[PDB]
Design an enzyme around this catalytic site. Structure first.
Site, mmCIF file in Angstrom:
data_model
loop_
_atom_site.group_PDB
_atom_site.id
_atom_site.type_symbol
_atom_site.label_atom_id
_atom_site.label_comp_id
_atom_site.label_asym_id
_atom_site.label_seq_id
_atom_site.Cartn_x
_atom_site.Cartn_y
_atom_site.Cartn_z
ATOM 1 N N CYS A 1 0.782 -1.246 0.000
ATOM 2 C CA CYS A 1 0.000 0.000 0.000
ATOM 3 C C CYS A 1 0.812 1.294 0.000
ATOM 4 O O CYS A 1 1.541 1.579 0.957
ATOM 5 C CB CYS A 1 -0.963 0.006 1.198
ATOM 6 S SG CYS A 1 -2.155 1.386 1.257
ATOM 7 N N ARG B 1 -0.010 4.584 3.165
ATOM 8 C CA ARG B 1 0.061 4.350 4.602
ATOM 9 C C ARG B 1 0.344 5.564 5.465
ATOM 10 O O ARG B 1 0.362 5.467 6.688
ATOM 11 C CB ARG B 1 1.072 3.254 4.908
ATOM 12 C CG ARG B 1 0.550 1.867 4.598
ATOM 13 C CD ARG B 1 1.600 0.813 4.852
ATOM 14 N NE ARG B 1 2.523 0.643 3.735
ATOM 15 C CZ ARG B 1 3.679 -0.008 3.817
ATOM 16 N NH1 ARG B 1 4.063 -0.539 4.969
ATOM 17 N NH2 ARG B 1 4.421 -0.192 2.735
ATOM 18 N N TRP C 1 -9.213 6.175 -0.387
ATOM 19 C CA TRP C 1 -9.756 6.785 -1.595
ATOM 20 C C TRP C 1 -9.016 6.148 -2.772
ATOM 21 O O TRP C 1 -8.163 5.281 -2.581
ATOM 22 C CB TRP C 1 -9.634 8.304 -1.620
ATOM 23 C CG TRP C 1 -8.327 8.829 -1.225
ATOM 24 C CD1 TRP C 1 -7.242 9.001 -2.020
ATOM 25 C CD2 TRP C 1 -7.964 9.307 0.072
ATOM 26 N NE1 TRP C 1 -6.212 9.568 -1.299
ATOM 27 C CE2 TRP C 1 -6.634 9.766 -0.009
ATOM 28 C CE3 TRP C 1 -8.637 9.389 1.301
ATOM 29 C CZ2 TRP C 1 -5.954 10.300 1.094
ATOM 30 C CZ3 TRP C 1 -7.966 9.916 2.401
ATOM 31 C CH2 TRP C 1 -6.633 10.370 2.287
ATOM 32 N N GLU D 1 -5.318 3.415 -10.673
ATOM 33 C CA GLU D 1 -6.046 2.175 -10.407
ATOM 34 C C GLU D 1 -7.234 2.041 -11.358
ATOM 35 O O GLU D 1 -7.607 0.934 -11.753
ATOM 36 C CB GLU D 1 -6.553 2.129 -8.955
ATOM 37 C CG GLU D 1 -5.454 2.099 -7.869
ATOM 38 C CD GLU D 1 -5.999 2.288 -6.444
ATOM 39 O OE1 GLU D 1 -7.011 1.642 -6.082
ATOM 40 O OE2 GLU D 1 -5.414 3.081 -5.676
HETATM 41 C C1 HEM Z 1 -5.676 6.766 1.855
HETATM 42 C C2 HEM Z 1 -6.210 5.974 0.891
HETATM 43 C C3 HEM Z 1 -5.489 4.948 0.368
HETATM 44 C C4 HEM Z 1 -4.772 4.958 -0.775
HETATM 45 C C5 HEM Z 1 -4.479 6.190 -1.660
HETATM 46 C C6 HEM Z 1 -4.348 3.603 -0.971
HETATM 47 C C7 HEM Z 1 -3.795 3.129 -2.102
HETATM 48 C C8 HEM Z 1 -3.533 1.777 -2.379
HETATM 49 C C9 HEM Z 1 -3.027 1.296 -3.637
HETATM 50 C C10 HEM Z 1 -2.641 2.118 -4.826
HETATM 51 C C11 HEM Z 1 -2.934 -0.016 -3.550
HETATM 52 C C12 HEM Z 1 -2.614 -0.870 -4.740
HETATM 53 C C13 HEM Z 1 -3.756 -1.815 -5.036
HETATM 54 C C14 HEM Z 1 -3.584 -2.550 -6.344
HETATM 55 O O1 HEM Z 1 -2.573 -2.313 -7.040
HETATM 56 O O2 HEM Z 1 -4.466 -3.368 -6.686
HETATM 57 C C15 HEM Z 1 -3.345 -0.406 -2.182
HETATM 58 C C16 HEM Z 1 -3.273 -1.691 -1.616
HETATM 59 C C17 HEM Z 1 -3.592 -2.091 -0.307
HETATM 60 N N1 HEM Z 1 -4.027 -1.220 0.642
HETATM 61 FE FE1 HEM Z 1 -4.160 0.841 0.475
HETATM 62 N N2 HEM Z 1 -4.736 2.797 0.038
HETATM 63 C C18 HEM Z 1 -5.455 3.606 0.870
HETATM 64 C C19 HEM Z 1 -6.046 3.162 2.063
HETATM 65 C C20 HEM Z 1 -5.980 1.912 2.682
HETATM 66 C C21 HEM Z 1 -6.736 1.517 3.886
HETATM 67 C C22 HEM Z 1 -7.790 2.367 4.589
HETATM 68 C C23 HEM Z 1 -6.343 0.205 4.186
HETATM 69 C C24 HEM Z 1 -6.699 -0.638 5.267
HETATM 70 C C25 HEM Z 1 -7.117 -0.272 6.544
HETATM 71 C C26 HEM Z 1 -5.384 -0.172 3.112
HETATM 72 C C27 HEM Z 1 -4.903 -1.504 2.925
HETATM 73 C C28 HEM Z 1 -4.261 -2.002 1.783
HETATM 74 C C29 HEM Z 1 -3.927 -3.401 1.543
HETATM 75 C C30 HEM Z 1 -3.921 -4.578 2.520
HETATM 76 C C31 HEM Z 1 -3.553 -3.465 0.266
HETATM 77 C C32 HEM Z 1 -3.282 -4.757 -0.438
HETATM 78 C C33 HEM Z 1 -4.355 -4.906 -1.501
HETATM 79 C C34 HEM Z 1 -4.382 -6.286 -2.141
HETATM 80 O O3 HEM Z 1 -3.319 -6.914 -2.290
HETATM 81 O O4 HEM Z 1 -5.483 -6.742 -2.497
HETATM 82 N N3 HEM Z 1 -5.200 0.891 2.226
HETATM 83 N N4 HEM Z 1 -3.744 0.707 -1.496
#
Ligand code: HEM
Ligand code: HEM
Lengths: 362, 362
Positions: A65, A68, A237, A242
């Site tokens: 992610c 973070r 968000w 994506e």
């Molecule tokens: C502030 C907003 C956030 C942004 C901009 C963000 C952005 C991203 C992005 C770009 C990815 C890549 C996903 C992909 O390539 O398919 C991701 C993955 C991930 N994010 Fe974040 N994220 C956000 C919030 C969160 C929150 C609220 C959580 C959990 C409490 C989180 C947990 C994760 C996890 C575990 C992954 C792994 C996804 C997977 O492998 O299926 N993220 N996020």
């Protein structure tokens, strides 16, 4: 063993958790109480504080992610009290609502009951609460291919889509005791969508592209102190790429590049023209522009990476080791323009964390 | 040990090599002869065939390379006969010449003598035979930052650049017995360069950008059957993004994005405009267009990846396991548009291969 695994995890979590919260003295008695409970009931129950923070720590430990930086501002909604299907439905509805927040999306997570003796109390089938269906007649493709199997599963329970490229799938889950899951269609007034237009190109709307406003992952398991929250849908968000570089651009997803190249008036004759690359940048620009026009939060890969950089710094200032997965951290558009590309990350799993779990359908 | 390591490698190489060449029966006597030689001299000597193919096998086993489809068409120039500094100079000159081939670049490799008892017979300092110098006065930067340390090293031996952004560094190597290396300036008639212009934008030439026409890596070690060819400069043609998305675009390299954004008439005010992304695609388009205009071979990331895909297929058809390094295989511009992005590779080292070796300077 299972009673051993639990108590081990518990001691480690409660220690790190209270250390961060500034309650190191309370670690003593709390651990005594958890000991009794594990031997008494065969498991323990987190406090609104332990779980809230645990959900935030699991966020911070999410290697894949890029966002973070805002781990500490997670909105943890505690719904471990649900007992019926209507309770679950109403909680997911509420989650979608409060999370959307009229466009100013709010990073949130709804904590449902965890597994008892390995048996789930609630089982969410959806990958994301809001998502489009996918169909592939012996003829051609309609919708999101990525949704193909879940769609099949839903039509097996009585659900039927209108068959457009953007059918909102229904909420689908199973309650402990029930053999098969149940579904509930999403009230369209709850779901914010955004039509895709371009700031300078007027023809761009002929493509009739649109995408939902909030991604809420709902098929991941959250591990905190030995306790397994198999159902805990969360959301942040979107990050422009994506939608603009993957969902709408992949050949196994929507595949809009040739169309985009046409409406922007460029040839798809030669690779040396870099039309795909030129189309991706116009589509990605369009996506960021539309969401912003409609007042729905979104972030471009440059600001995101820049925000991630600040996270790396903070993690070092606080004394925590940093872990990351480079192959998922770099944006799919201009990776070498962000610092993430040029450095390396330790892809080590640290709990609490979110993990993949096996799909009930399939 | 060293006599053991060698004989081990030798048996494995000669076996695989002859198997491919269709000389499995000759493996017997050849290995008997190599046995005597290893015990007699303490090493062995490859045949024009063993080495030629060995160089081609090492190419095919290069995980980080997207153009292995043409592994079998390598032009191996055998120069294990060199004894003086003039011999080496003339061989590098010839290599640059014949390789350039008036624009129709030819993948080639010059095999110099290998190490004897660990001691090098020839030691090439240059990273690439043709490359620009780099300087950083207490004030600002001139040239290619990547060349900073080698440039310093050369000025320590009497060489002095004019200090433009594109000074061709001289050839620099050390011969066994000599304490310090020697340098020879490159005759400018041997070095093909290409000024960067844009097909639709006339203002693009104000940037006064240019890049040499052939990349010849010269600091890598080639291992074949236990024998270490520390000096064996090789080359393929360029892949547009190497110049347009890295060399000219990186902040630690040339850093031309803000300038490019200006000449193409777009603002560098907001990240949400994706100007960097828009600038990269125009610069990359310009690079491919100029090299093609001047008749110097080059390949865009789409054709390359497409060519690599065909390699993966051929490797399976021939029965060979495939190895690759995803983090270097994906192009730095629109990675998710090529199949490489969506699959995975086994990053396993298989010899014969090319390896990094420690820089003499620094
Ligand atoms: C502030 C907003 C956030 C942004 C901009 C963000 C952005 C991203 C992005 C770009 C990815 C890549 C996903 C992909 O390539 O398919 C991701 C993955 C991930 N994010 Fe974040 N994220 C956000 C919030 C969160 C929150 C609220 C959580 C959990 C409490 C989180 C947990 C994760 C996890 C575990 C992954 C792994 C996804 C997977 O492998 O299926 N993220 N996020
Ligand atoms: C047909 C022309 C060729 C093309 C289009 C091609 C392309 C590439 C590209 C794009 C890279 C990435 C380099 C980077 O990101 O810095 C690379 C790496 C590499 N290539 Fe190839 N290549 C070609 C020919 C060759 C030849 C002739 C050899 C050797 C006989 C070879 C050996 C390697 C090796 C060992 C690397 C690793 C480079 C390093 O880590 O420094 N390639 N090549």
């Amino acid at each position: 063993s299972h009673a051993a695994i639990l108590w081990n995890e518990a001691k480690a979590f409660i220690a790190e958790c209270y250390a961060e919260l500034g309650k190191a003295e309370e670690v003593a008695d709390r651990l005594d109480s958890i000991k009794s409970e594990i031997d008494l009931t065969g498991s323990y129950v987190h406090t609104k504080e332990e779980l809230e923070h645990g959900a935030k720590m699991a966020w911070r430990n999410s290697n894949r992610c890029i966002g973070r930086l805002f781990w500490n501002s997670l909105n943890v909604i505690d719904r471990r009290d649900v007992r019926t299907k209507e309770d679950v439905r109403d909680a997911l509805f509420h989650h979608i609502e409060t999370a959307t927040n009229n466009g100013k999306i709010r990073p949130s997570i709804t904590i449902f009951p965890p597994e008892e003796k390995g048996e789930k109390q609630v089982e969410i089938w959806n990958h994301q609460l809001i998502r489009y269906a996918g169909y592939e007649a012996a003829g051609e493709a309609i919708g999101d291919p990525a949704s193909c199997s879940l769609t099949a599963a839903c039509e097996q329970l009585g659900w039927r889509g209108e068959r457009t490229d953007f059918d909102l799938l229904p909420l689908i889950f199973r309650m402990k005791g029930d053999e098969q899951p149940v579904w509930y269609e999403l009230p369209r007034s709850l779901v914010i969508e955004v039509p895709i237009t371009h700031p300078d190109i007027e023809a761009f709307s002929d493509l009739e592209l649109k995408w939902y406003g909030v991604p809420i992952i709902s098929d991941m398991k959250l591990e905190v102190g030995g306790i397994h929250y198999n159902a805990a849908p969360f959301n942040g968000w979107y990050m422009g790429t994506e939608i603009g570089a993957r969902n709408l651009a992949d050949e196994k997803r929507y595949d809009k590049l040739k169309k985009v190249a046409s409406v922007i008036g460029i040839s798809t004759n030669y690779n040396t023209d870099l039309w795909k690359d030129q189309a991706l940048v116009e589509l990605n620009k369009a996506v960021l522009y539309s969401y912003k026009k409609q007042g729905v939060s979104i972030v471009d890969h440059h600001t995101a990476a820049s925000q991630f950089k600040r996270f790396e710094e903070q993690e070092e200032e606080a004394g925590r080791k940093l872990t990351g997965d480079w192959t998922w951290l770099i944006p799919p558009i201009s990776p070498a323009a962000t610092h993430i590309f040029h450095r390396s990350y330790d892809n080590s799993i640290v709990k609490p964390n979110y993990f993949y779990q096996d799909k009930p359908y399939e």
